Amino acid sequence: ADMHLQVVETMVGCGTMKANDYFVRNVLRQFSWDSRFLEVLYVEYRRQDDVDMWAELTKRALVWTARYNAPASERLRRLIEDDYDTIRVQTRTFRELAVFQFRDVEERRHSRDVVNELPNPWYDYVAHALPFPDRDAGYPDEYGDLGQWRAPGGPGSPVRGPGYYAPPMEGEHQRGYTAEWRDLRNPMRPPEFPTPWERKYRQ
């Protein structure tokens, strides 16, 4: 399709009034054409002797954009808008123009207002979109309690062993239960951080 596009653009620039005929015969129904074709054909149309011929050609081009699934681009729409006085070819939707009206007036009013220019932490940003806290709130407590018999706790419980005494444990399990597991009721030190940042919080 780009080859036909350059052909059409060359015709329009050269000023022959057959670019539209070539577009209809060669690239309209047989190709998946963007609206740059029409951005060129609109300049081609604008040179028509009859203002009504210009307008009708524009409207037919829009109907082509609808029938063949090629949306009208913003540049094409603005090109057609810039001639709204001579040809009254509407180019913006009855919803789009209403939202433009309301949003634009609101935005100019908001910018010209001074108080509402102040920052708002609730609407400005999100803080800590991560799944886990960025610091240790102390929890969990990996030790049971005196009234608790369910020592390992099972699926959802963080407790890993009974509160005070347990059966004999071996290797890493004994090491963890004796020393390394989180003991959250300790009154002298809180649970201990990894190696590089325990030293700098020792005191």
């Binding site: 399709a1 080859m3 047989q30 998946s32 054409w33 963007d34 029938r67």
Partner: protein, 50 residues
């Protein structure tokens, strides 16, 4: 009303021209030398445009 393009056949004519060549890894040494000259010209072009 219009002529569509089913998943089976490209039935509307391409919307962009493409080059009929292998990938850069399947070229010969001299073929990739031609490709190298082409690509340095392409970079000259993009820098001129920039």
């Amino acid at each position: 009303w219009r002529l569509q393009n089913n998943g089976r056949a490209l039935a509307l004519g391409p919307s962009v021209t493409i080059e009929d060549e292998m990938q850069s890894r399947f070229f010969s040494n001299d073929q990739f030398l031609v490709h190298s000259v082409k690509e340095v010209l392409r970079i000259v072009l993009q820098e001129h445009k920039r």
